[PDB]
Amino acid sequence: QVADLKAFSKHIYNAYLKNFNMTKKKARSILTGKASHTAPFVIHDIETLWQAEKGLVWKQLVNGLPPYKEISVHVFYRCQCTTVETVRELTEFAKSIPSFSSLFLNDQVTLLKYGVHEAIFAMLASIVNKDGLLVANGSGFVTREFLRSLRKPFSDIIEPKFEFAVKFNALELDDSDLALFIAAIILCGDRPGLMNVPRVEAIQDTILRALEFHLQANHPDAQYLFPKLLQKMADLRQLVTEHAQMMQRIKKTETETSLHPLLQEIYKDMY
Amino acid sequence: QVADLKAFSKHIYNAYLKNFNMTKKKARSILTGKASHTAPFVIHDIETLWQAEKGLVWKQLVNGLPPYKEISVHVFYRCQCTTVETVRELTEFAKSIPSFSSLFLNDQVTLLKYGVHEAIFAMLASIVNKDGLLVANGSGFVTREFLRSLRKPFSDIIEPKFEFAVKFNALELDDSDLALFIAAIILCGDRPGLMNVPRVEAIQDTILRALEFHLQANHPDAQYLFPKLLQKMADLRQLVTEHAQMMQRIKKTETETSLHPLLQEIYKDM
Ligand SMILES: CC(C)(Oc1ccc(CCCN(CCc2c(F)cccc2Cl)C(=O)Nc2cccc(Cl)c2Cl)cc1)C(=O)O
Ligand SMILES: CC(C)(Oc1ccc(CCCN(CCc2c(F)cccc2Cl)C(=O)Nc2cccc(Cl)c2Cl)cc1)C(=O)O
């Protein structure tokens, strides 16, 4: 409609504000320039990361890169705990979605398991910059260069996500649209092992229609809307595909570094 | 020709369809359940109105209320802003009727002066409901309760119309019928200052003729509809008189509020 659909693209919006502490507009906030309200402790190297492990208080020993675990692997490790924490908000997000909680628990898991990462790599863009990423609830800011300065296996597992973030932030979206662009990716019927495909697909459509008129209310000046946003939903389906591969290679040669159980469950079917 | 009279009534319908931004079909379809829709933003308080001004915009007017122009006066400002736009559509409608467009400009004006509010009050029913009414191209829906909760002057100038629309919509007319009805109330030979009243009288007769015959093929089992629509015309002719009087009082008592120049011309001697 034009209101019931206006209240739908709104409800999901509150579900997106009450489940994600770091919103794009609250992140774009820090990454300003003439802002001293919040100055993020920049990393760029092993020294700043070490003290960051103190100045930004991270419960996991004042660092964590001995002759068993190293710098690189400790970042990857740090990377997965945030992810695991974001998978958590997404779950609480999707559950706040209307007909989502309608689905049987098994289907809710299938949707998350397969779309929780495409969604997260999409929000990544919200806290990104051409020169770095926001970490530690806005208090940190790990430079992009620093991350490319990581070991061989790792290091190249975060750069493509930047390549995407750059472009994806060129569409100039805002939290309102993101709330809908996320719920759309989670409510994806093309997910493997989905039980009530017709149902999911139906909720999807109303999502994409909600996102439809909404890109009309807020943004009235382009064409990014859908052919670009929808194409980016596909672009994300590959980023995840390439990401699941490095992950499988890491698990196959990085016998030293562990993988969070939850993340091991998510992977093991994708290809 | 009794036959072929059901042909020029389609040309009057085409003028209606191509000129009025809101048709009773689009309205009935909007004031009906939200089963796949648009859903209007209910305006019932001062807050929903302020919200409205933002959500549904409205460009002009808007603003505050205590200074000179107030909340009630704000509504009356909005009413007269759409009344001046439906007058613009009515005038284009009348112009899309050869017969009408045949008369001399000066006559076309006198007709579009004594009849435009009567038409205007017949169309209001299409966009009205038992409880409230559509505004801003179906975008909004200002309730009847909100309207009658205004300052006593402005409060009772909108109520008689609701009273009228409820009964009118019981006749169950559609747009093809309203096109004819509206056209009949416009081309009325009994208007003050009419120059060529005979010609006008005649054009009306053909409209009333097609109209009675149109009610044939469209409302078969319908009761005494034609003559019923005739009494409505007279009803419409009196409500426009009491409205003109209410307007007369607000022009004497409500000097703080202003009236649209085109609207003062219409009432300059009505
Ligand atoms: C196995 C794993 C964890 O791989 C990933 C690897 C990297 C990323 C991306 C960037 C990591 N990240 C943001 C996660 C996030 C978030 F918190 C909110 C929204 C979106 C996103 Cl993407 C982050 O905060 N990392 C970090 C912390 C301290 C130091 C350093 Cl040197 C780094 Cl790179 C995502 C998944 C996965 O796919 O689940
Ligand atoms: C001086 C004046 C203007 O007095 C009137 C007062 C009210 C009306 C009728 C209702 C007004 N209207 C529809 C005009 C219309 C139309 F747009 C299409 C077909 C028919 C009609 Cl009768 C409307 O949209 N009003 C409105 C807008 C915003 C908020 C609120 Cl609280 C309101 Cl009441 C008519 C004349 C007049 O006599 O012309």
Swiss-Prot record, chain A:
What keywords does the record list, in alphabetical order?
Activator, DNA-binding, Metal-binding, Nucleus, Receptor, Transcription, Transcription regulation, Ubl conjugation, Zinc, Zinc-finger
Per the record, what is one GO cellular component? nucleoplasm
The residues covered by the NR LBD domain are 41-269
Q: How is it modified after translation?
A: 'Lys-48'-linked polyubiquitinated; leading to proteasomal degradation. Deubiquitinated and stabilized by OTUD3.
Q: Which molecular function terms from Gene Ontology are attached?
A: DNA binding; DNA-binding transcription factor activity; DNA-binding transcription factor activity, RNA polymerase II-specific; DNA-binding transcription repressor activity, RNA polymerase II-specific; linoleic acid binding; lipid binding; NF-kappaB binding; nuclear receptor activity
Q: Which GO terms describe its biological process?
A: adipose tissue development; apoptotic process; apoptotic signaling pathway; axon ensheathment; cell differentiation; cell population proliferation; cell-substrate adhesion; cellular response to hypoxia
Tissues of expression: Ubiquitous with maximal levels in placenta and skeletal muscle.
Top-level lineage group? Eukaryota
Tell me where in or outside the cell this protein is found: Nucleus
Q: What is its biological role?
A: Ligand-activated transcription factor key mediator of energy metabolism in adipose tissues. Receptor that binds peroxisome proliferators such as hypolipidemic drugs and fatty acids. Has a preference for poly-unsaturated fatty acids, such as gamma-linoleic acid and eicosapentanoic acid. Once activated by a ligand, the receptor binds to promoter elements of target genes. Regulates the peroxisomal beta-oxidation pathway of fatty acids. Functions as transcription activator for the acyl-CoA oxidase gene. Decreases expression of NPC1L1 once activated by a ligand.
**How would you summarize the oligomeric state and partners of this protein?**
Heterodimer with the retinoid X receptor. Interacts (via domain NR LBD) with CRY1 and CRY2 in a ligand-dependent manner.
Family that this chain belongs to: Belongs to the nuclear hormone receptor family. NR1 subfamily.
What is this protein's name? Peroxisome proliferator-activated receptor delta
From the UniProt record, report the name of the gene that encodes this protein: PPARD
